[PDB]
Amino acid sequence: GKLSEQLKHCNGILKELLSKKHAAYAWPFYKPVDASALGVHDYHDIIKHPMDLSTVKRKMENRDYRDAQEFAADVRLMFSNCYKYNPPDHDVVAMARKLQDVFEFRYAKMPD
Numbered sequence: 001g002k003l004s005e006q007l008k009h010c011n012g013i014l015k016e017l018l019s020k021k022h023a024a025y026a027w028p029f030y031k032p033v034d035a036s037a038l039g040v041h042d043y044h045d046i047i048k049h050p051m052d053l054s055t056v057k058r059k060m061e062n063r064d065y066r067d068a069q070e071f072a073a074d075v076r077l078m079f080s081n082c083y084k085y086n087p088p089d090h091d092v093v094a095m096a097r098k099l100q101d102v103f104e105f106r107y108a109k110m111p112d
């Protein structure tokens with residue numbers, strides 16, 4: 001059925017994270033990490049709970065998230081996985097920080 005007001009805001013955020021204006025740093029987060037394709041054969045030994053924006057989108061459409069907090073925990077898990085696997089100076093980490101800045105500042109504008 002209809003998303004709660006808070007989940008509508010979350011959906012708006014998700015749409016923004018997937019939009020062209022953020023694509024320069026958001027693109028690595030669009031789909032699940034393909035460890036074999038990228039040659040990172042230790043990725044799934046290190047990252048026990050993969051997450052990505054396509055998965056968040058599917059969960060939103062399927063009404064998997066019961067509240068905004070559950071949604072935010074998944075988006076933050078996605079960034080945390082990036083910070084866990086990669087050295088802090090790597091390009092993909094800089095991209096994560098930038099997308100997380102976009103995310104956290106709009107999430108903070110959550111309606112009430």
Ligand SMILES: COC(=O)[C@H](C)[C@@H]1N=C(c2ccc(Cl)cc2)c2cc(OC)ccc2-n2c(C)nnc21
Pocket residue numbers: 027028029033034038040043081082085086091092
């Ligand atoms: C060798 O290290 C890697 O390839 C990372 C595992 C990988 N880097 C990258 C990565 C590496 C360099 C740049 Cl400039 C951007 C992303 C990556 C690439 C993608 O291509 C579709 C998908 C996901 C990632 N990603 C995410 C998210 N978190 N870590 C990565």
Ligand SMILES: C[C@H](O)COC[C@H](C)O
Pocket residue numbers: 097098100101104105
């Ligand atoms: C860069 C840190 O990992 C996340 O910072 C969030 C802040 C709102 O930019």
Ligand SMILES: [Cl-]
Pocket residue numbers: 072073076
């Ligand atoms: Cl959280």
